[PDB]
């Protein structure tokens, strides 16, 4: 089940236009759009009940939404600016006042120039021999740098299996330059585990780049959505 | 100096004698400028100041539709609270709601409030942080949960931060001009 939102990752150049769709729960008549910035606090945009407006909050005149006969709501963004770079959520209560269910939320980042979009560069650095000798808990730092914007989701994969226990990822990506970021995450592992040469480690970095609709200036590979990984086997010593 | 715009909402219940007379009153700073009264031969929003009489004709119809909509919900609420408190089916009751935002002379929001009241006693109110609630009794504890699940705190917060201040700026422009 659940309420669907799409698309969840879009790179739009300044002065562009895009539409955000939201497919609410079946039978739910009240839909409501929520803007949440990359800062904090939740902004109420507008709420629709049974294909009509009900209350308007922060929704600028540049944005226009509407509910269709399938009750699904589309948010039409025109003349985008960098301040509109945020995440947009869609709650869909059954009636007004009833419990609302949020969608996955869609991340929109407005870039000044589309040519600055660039996938990351990932690398995997093995733990220091002094760490495994003294602390006996090895640590695999993973450094993904040089990407723009930060539509990144870093994950750790051991033996072809995604793991969450004992990993520590930076919560917010550190911005190195005006148009290039960098994110790091270290996974701590025991000495007996890391020393086994049969255990495969891998740090993959998901990157949601440009869409196929956006024309890419030639003379360069298009920074499409893609995930690049840095892997390293265990080494006994 | 710091200016303010506030609304008072009254829903007095009369059982058998009639229907709950419901009225909204709007104060800019401290001077009332609009009023809705349910008990009238033909009820609608009326201006209470010569500078409010300048506002357009779509304003009065757009608000009256909203005002009538608030009457229907509060008419249900008077019935809804009686199930919370186990009140007698035939008794007089009153709900009072004050809503408003006051801004400093800089035009920036200083504070915004919304305080529900029942039979002259406090019930619930929006907090200083504009995201949380403070319920007064066990019945308001039930109401607080419904508003958290419905995201009601954000609709009220956006109204206080945005629609209230923008409208205060427009209202004050008409009052100072005339």
């Amino acid at each position: 089940s659940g309420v669907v939102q799409s698309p969840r990752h879009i790179i739009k150049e300044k002065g562009g236009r895009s539409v955000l769709t939201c497919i609410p729960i079946s039978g739910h008549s009240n839909v409501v759009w929520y803007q949440q910035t990359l800062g904090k606090e939740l902004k109420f945009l507008i709420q629709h009940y049974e294909k009509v407006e009900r209350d308007k909050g922060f929704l600028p005149c540049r944005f226009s939404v509407q509910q269709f006969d399938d009750y699904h709501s589309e948010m039409n963004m025109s003349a985008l600016e960098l301040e509109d770079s945020a995440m947009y959520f869609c709650a869909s209560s059954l009636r007004w006042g009833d419990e609302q269910y949020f969608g996955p939320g869609t991340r929109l980042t407005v870039v000044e120039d589309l040519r600055n979009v660039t996938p990351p560069k990932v690398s995997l650095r093995e733990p220091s021999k002094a760490e495994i000798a003294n602390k006996q808990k090895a640590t695999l730092q993973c450094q993904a740098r040089g990407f723009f914007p930060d539509h990144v989701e870093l994950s750790w994969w051991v033996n072809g299996k995604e793991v969450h226990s004992g990993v520590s990822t930076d919560p917010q990506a550190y911005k190195e330059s005006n148009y290039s970021y960098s994110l790091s995450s270290r996974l701590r592992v025991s000495a007996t585990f890391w020393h086994n040469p049969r255990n495969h480690f891998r740090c993959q970095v998901q990157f949601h780049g440009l869409s196929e609709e956006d024309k890419w200036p030639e003379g360069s590979p298009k920074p499409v959505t893609q995930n690049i990984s840095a892997e390293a086997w265990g080494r006994a010593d | 100096g710091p200016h303010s715009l506030r609304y008072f909402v009254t829903a007095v219940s009369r059982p058998g004698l009639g229907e709950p007379r419901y009225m909204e009153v709007g104060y800019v700073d401290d001077t009332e400028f609009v009023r809705f009264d349910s008990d009238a031969e033909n009820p609608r929003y009326e201006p209470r100041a010569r500078w409010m009489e300048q506002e357009g004709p779509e304003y009065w119809e757009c608000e009256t539709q909203k005002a009538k909509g608030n009457e229907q919900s509060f008419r249900v609420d008077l019935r809804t609270l009686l199930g919370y408190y186990n009140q007698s089916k035939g008794g007089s009751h009153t709900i009072q709601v004050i809503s408003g935002c006051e801004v400093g002379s800089d035009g920036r929001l200083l504070r915004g409030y919304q305080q529900y009241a029942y039979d002259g006693q406090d019930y619930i109110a929006l907090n200083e942080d504009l995201k949380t609630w403070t319920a007064a009794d066990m019945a308001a504890l039930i109401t607080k949960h419904k508003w958290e699940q419905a995201g009601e705190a954000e609709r009220l917060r956006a109204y206080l931060e945005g629609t209230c201040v923008e409208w205060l700026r427009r209202y004050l422009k008409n009052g100072n001009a005339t």
Binding site: W96, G97 | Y7, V9, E24, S73, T80, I124, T163, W167
Partner: peptide, 8 residues
């Protein structure tokens, strides 16, 4: 303008 009160 006025708040659009909903059910409590």
């Amino acid at each position: 303008r006025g708040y659009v009160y909903q059910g409590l």
